Every structure is written in structure tokens, then in C-alpha cells.
């Protein structure tokens, strides 16, 4: 995190912040709750109350990420609707504005499609986490039985050491202890192997999505040169638009670069 | 009599495994049930070993006392 | 449409094989059903081959005539 040695909510600015000052906080952060939905905030609480004790926090994480997934599909549909609206609105303006808006809407629709693919990959990762949630929830009854049986052993040996079930309960306890030891070993292996794999898949999806949107942004930034900021005096008017071929070539190149992109084609090199 | 529930659980769980793998191999509980089955199998193996030892050691001792 | 009953029979017979081998592996029809399944599999393989040839040869010919 970009925090600092301070007792205030202010954070340490970065190079981008120094070059570009941050905008004021969004006007869409209205004071209702930031909730999004009542079911959104109640599903998590319902999942975190019932079920096995061991599989409680993990179930909460699964439900929270399911809400993440729902909100992401909502924002993907919203963004594709915004692209459609921009494409529709581009008609009323000049030819150059119309073409630029159409290409920008195409790029935003492509971004929405990539978001949907990332949504599918995120659901795959969520199911991978659900598997470990289920196995830990199934493991929990073993240790619950172990503690119940050891409590019974302590109670019987305290109330009457010369009980008829003097050693049968102890032998059952030791075999349950062996079963619980095997269960704990397999739980550790599976949890730690599907955490490092589900999160690896999630990070692969993250980097692929980020690279694709970065390519989209770069190609749109290069396309935006066809639009002109030259202002016209009220009497005058521009000559006819002639940059159709340039826009066509740039969108063809964008599509080709997106198709060619692979895991090894990522230019991001962390240090 | 206390050992018997372990093997009863083992057979019930293996029956559930067979049913799930026959009806739909791509079940959500694809491997959690198998891991629970293998840990139950280890517990049942320990239970069978201790049952054999205790039964065969208290038969040879109770009957020795009876014959004395 | 005539080929389809062959594969329908194949899936029904393999479902019966799975059911019989899951419920009771030591069934009286232990291997007769398997041999019937393998001969049905050979028949279905021949049927699939001939279906592929005829479909792909009468598609390229009917559409060639249509385009002419």
C-alpha cells in the first residue's frame, strides 16, 4: 500500500500523482450506504452464521466473491450499454466524430467482452476455492468428534475411573486421532495446493485482462489523432473527412494484436 | 460393538462414492468424499488392528482364567 | 435417422453394463452383455464411418448441383 509515516488518511503520492494531480472524489459516492443491495450484504452474513465452524470464513469469502462476480457482470453489461449509447449518439455529429465514436464504441464493447471472459475465469477460480471450502467443511466433523470423544474420556475418568468402558473409548479415541491426523495432513496439502493454483490462475487471468485493456487503450489513444481539435470560425467549414482508411487500418491492427496476444507475449516485466 | 460403526460408516461412504461416480462423475464433491473415504479407511484399519489384538488377547486370557 | 438407433442402442447397453457392474459385479450376465456391447460397438463404428462418407459426399454433390 502507498501509505506513509503519518496519522492521517492521506497517502504518499506516486510519480503519476506528482505529474498528474488527483481529481476530487467522485460525486457518485453518495451517502446511502454504498451497499449496492440488501441481499448483497445479507447473503454473506447468512453464510457466515450457519455451517461448520471451520468452513465459515471461507464460505463468507466465497459469497463475497460471488457478489464481486455479480457486480462485475453488472458493470460489464453497463459498459456495453454505454458503448451502444455512444455509438447511437455519434450519428448526430460530424462524420469524423461519428466514425471516431463508432470505433471507440467498438473498443469499449471489446473491453466488455474481455471483462466477461475474465468473469468466467473468476468463476472458475471461485469454484476452485469452493472445493477447498467443501473439503474443510467435511474435515471439521472429524475433529468435532475427536474433541467430543476426548471430553467424554475426561468426564468418565474424572467421575468414575473404574468405568465399564475403561479402554474401549480410549482405543476409539486413538483410532479417531489417527483418522484426524490423516485428515489434517490431506487438508493442509489440498488447501495449500489449491490456493497456490487457484490464485495462480486468477493472477494469469488478471495479467491477461490488464494487458488486453492496455492494448485497447493504446490503440484508442493512437486512433484519437484522427479527431481534430482545430476550431472553425462561424462562417467557414472543413473539407470532407478522408481518414476512413487510417481508422480502418488502426482497428484492424488492434484486432490483430489482440488475437496474437498470448501468455508469453506479455511485455510487463516485474522486478 | 463400538468398532462396528466405523466399518458401517466406511461401507456407507463407499456406497455413496460409487453412486456419485456412476450417476455423475463430474460432481462438485468429486474428491472431498474420496479423501474422507481414505481417512475413514485409515481409521478403520487402526480399529481393525486394535480389535484383533484386544479380542485375541482377552480371549486367551479370559479363557485361561476360566480354565484355572 | 436410421444410423441413430445404433448409437441409441450402444448408449443404452453401456448404461446397462454400468448399472449391472455397479449393483452386483458377480451378475449371471457378467460377460455376455460385454460381448454384445463390443459387437454393437463394431457395428456402430462401421455405421459412423459410412454415415460420415455418405453425408460428406452427398453434401459436396447436392450443393454442387444446387450451385450449378
Amino acid at each position: 500500500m502507498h501509505r506513509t509515516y503519518s496519522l492521517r488518511n492521506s497517502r504518499a503520492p506516486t510519480a503519476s500523482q506528482l505529474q498528474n494531480p488527483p481529481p476530487p472524489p467522485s460525486t457518485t459516492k453518495g451517502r446511502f450506504f454504498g451497499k449496492g443491495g440488501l441481499a448483497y450484504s445479507f447473503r454473506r452474513s447468512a453464510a457466515g452464521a450457519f455451517g461448520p465452524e471451520l468452513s465459515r470464513k471461507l464460505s463468507q469469502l466465497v459469497k463475497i466473491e460471488k457478489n464481486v462476480l455479480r457486480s462485475m457482470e453488472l458493470t460489464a453489461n453497463e459498459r456495453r450499454d454505454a458503448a451502444k449509447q455512444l455509438s447511437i449518439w455519434g450519428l448526430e455529429n460530424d462524420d469524423d466524430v461519428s466514425d471516431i465514436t463508432d470505433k471507440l464504441g467498438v473498443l469499449i464493447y471489446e473491453v466488455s467482452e474481455l471483462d466477461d471472459q475474465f468473469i468466467d475465469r473468476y468463476d472458475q477460480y471461485r469454484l476452485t476455492l469452493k472445493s477447498i471450502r467443501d473439503i474443510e467443511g467435511s474435515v471439521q466433523p472429524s475433529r468435532d468428534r475427536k474433541d467430543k470423544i476426548t471430553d467424554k474420556i475426561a468426564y468418565l475418568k474424572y467421575k468414575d475411573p473404574q468405568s465399564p468402558k475403561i479402554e474401549v473409548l480410549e482405543q476409539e479415541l486413538v483410532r479417531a486421532e489417527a483418522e484426524s491426523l490423516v485428515a489434517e495432513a490431506q487438508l493442509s496439502n489440498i488447501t495449500r495446493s489449491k490456493l497456490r493454483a487457484a490464485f495462480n490462475y486468477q493472477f494469469d487471468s488478471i495479467i491477461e485482462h490488464s494487458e488486453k485493456i492496455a492494448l485497447i487503450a493504446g490503440y484508442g489513444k493512437a486512433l484519437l489523432e484522427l479527431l481534430d481539435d482545430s476550431p472553425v470560425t462561424p462562417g467557414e467549414t472543413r473539407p470532407a473527412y478522408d481518414g476512413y482508411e487510417a481508422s480502418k487500418q488502426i482497428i484492424i491492427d488492434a484486432e490483430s494484436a489482440l488475437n496474437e496476444w498470448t501468455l508469453d507475449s506479455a511485455q510487463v516485466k516485474p522486478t
Side-chain angles (χ1 to χ4, degrees), chain A residues 205-246:
Chain A
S205 63
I206 284 282
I207 177 189
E208 171 203 327
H209 194 39
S210 305
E211 264 317 284
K212 288 234 184 54
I213 316 200
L215 294 163
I216 292 280
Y219 265 113
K221 271 206 272 157
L223 169 142
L224 273 181
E225 270 75 7
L226 300 194
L227 219 32
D228 223 358
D229 273 355
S230 72
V232 299
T233 82
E236 307 283 29
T237 172
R238 309 177 159 174
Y241 194 22
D242 82 303
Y244 279 74
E245 170 82 322

Side-chain angles (χ1 to χ4, degrees), chain A residues 257-270:
Chain A
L258 289 151
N259 280 51
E260 171 146 0
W261 197 96
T262 188
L263 210 58
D264 203 19
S265 156
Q267 49 268 68
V268 164
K269 306 254 153 265

Side-chain angles (χ1 to χ4, degrees), chain A residues 126-138:
Chain A
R126 183 182 88 97
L127 289 203
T128 323
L129 282 201
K130 270 220 229 169
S131 90
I132 88 176
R133 196 265 323 252
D134 297 325
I135 181 190
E136 87 181 8
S138 94

Side-chain angles (χ1 to χ4, degrees), chain A residues 106-246:
Chain A
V106 167
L107 289 191
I108 301 183
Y109 200 87
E110 188 142 25
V111 152
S112 159
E113 288 180 348
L114 300 169
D115 253 349
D116 267 341
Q117 305 193 320
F118 173 50
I119 280 155
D120 302 349
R121 289 176 246 118
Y122 210 104
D123 206 34
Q124 205 76 6
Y125 141 68
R126 183 182 88 97
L127 289 203
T128 323
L129 282 201
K130 270 220 229 169
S131 90
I132 88 176
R133 196 265 323 252
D134 297 325
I135 181 190
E136 87 181 8
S138 94
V139 152
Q140 197 264 358
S142 162
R143 75 168 58 183
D144 183 338
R145 141 180 54 229
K146 166 99 158 287
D147 298 89
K148 183 248 289 173
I149 277 149
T150 201
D151 180 339
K152 241 172 177 180
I153 272 296
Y155 177 24
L156 254 298
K157 263 44 180 194
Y158 140 79
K159 182 62 56 164
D160 43 310
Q162 307 287 339
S163 153
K165 65 212 289 175
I166 170 156
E167 216 81 359
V168 55
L169 206 50
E170 195 257 18
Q171 280 124 15
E172 192 275 329
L173 184 153
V174 71
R175 66 194 210 236
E177 181 284 359
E179 153 202 33
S180 176
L181 172 141
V182 152
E184 292 287 11
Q186 89 190 0
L187 170 53
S188 163
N189 310 296
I190 278 154
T191 284
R192 143 187 37 99
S193 159
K194 282 195 170 208
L195 176 85
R196 178 224 167 82
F199 264 108
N200 209 348
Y201 184 42
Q202 161 68 16
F203 281 162
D204 263 348
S205 63
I206 284 282
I207 177 189
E208 171 203 327
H209 194 39
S210 305
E211 264 317 284
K212 288 234 184 54
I213 316 200
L215 294 163
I216 292 280
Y219 265 113
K221 271 206 272 157
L223 169 142
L224 273 181
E225 270 75 7
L226 300 194
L227 219 32
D228 223 358
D229 273 355
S230 72
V232 299
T233 82
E236 307 283 29
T237 172
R238 309 177 159 174
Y241 194 22
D242 82 303
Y244 279 74
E245 170 82 322

Side-chain angles (χ1 to χ4, degrees), chain A residues 40-142:
Chain A
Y40 271 59
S41 86
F42 253 49
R43 194 79 141 151
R44 34 171 90 162
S45 209
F50 288 66
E53 191 45 76
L54 187 50
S55 96
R56 204 152 256 154
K57 289 137 187 326
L58 207 36
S59 194
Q60 271 204 260
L61 170 57
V62 159
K63 245 57 185 171
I64 274 146
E65 277 191 351
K66 180 252 199 63
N67 285 347
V68 170
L69 258 161
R70 213 151 272 208
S71 157
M72 285 182 54
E73 81 166 20
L74 171 55
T75 203
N77 297 10
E78 284 306 332
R79 199 183 270 125
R80 91 170 70 251
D81 225 325
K84 292 175 182 175
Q85 247 298 335
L86 180 86
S87 211
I88 292 309
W89 171 81
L91 283 169
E92 283 83 2
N93 294 290
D94 316 321
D95 307 343
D96 54 82
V97 176
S98 162
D99 196 35
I100 287 314
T101 49
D102 212 347
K103 302 309 192 286
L104 293 186
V106 167
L107 289 191
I108 301 183
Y109 200 87
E110 188 142 25
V111 152
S112 159
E113 288 180 348
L114 300 169
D115 253 349
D116 267 341
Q117 305 193 320
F118 173 50
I119 280 155
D120 302 349
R121 289 176 246 118
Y122 210 104
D123 206 34
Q124 205 76 6
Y125 141 68
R126 183 182 88 97
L127 289 203
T128 323
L129 282 201
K130 270 220 229 169
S131 90
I132 88 176
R133 196 265 323 252
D134 297 325
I135 181 190
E136 87 181 8
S138 94
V139 152
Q140 197 264 358
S142 162

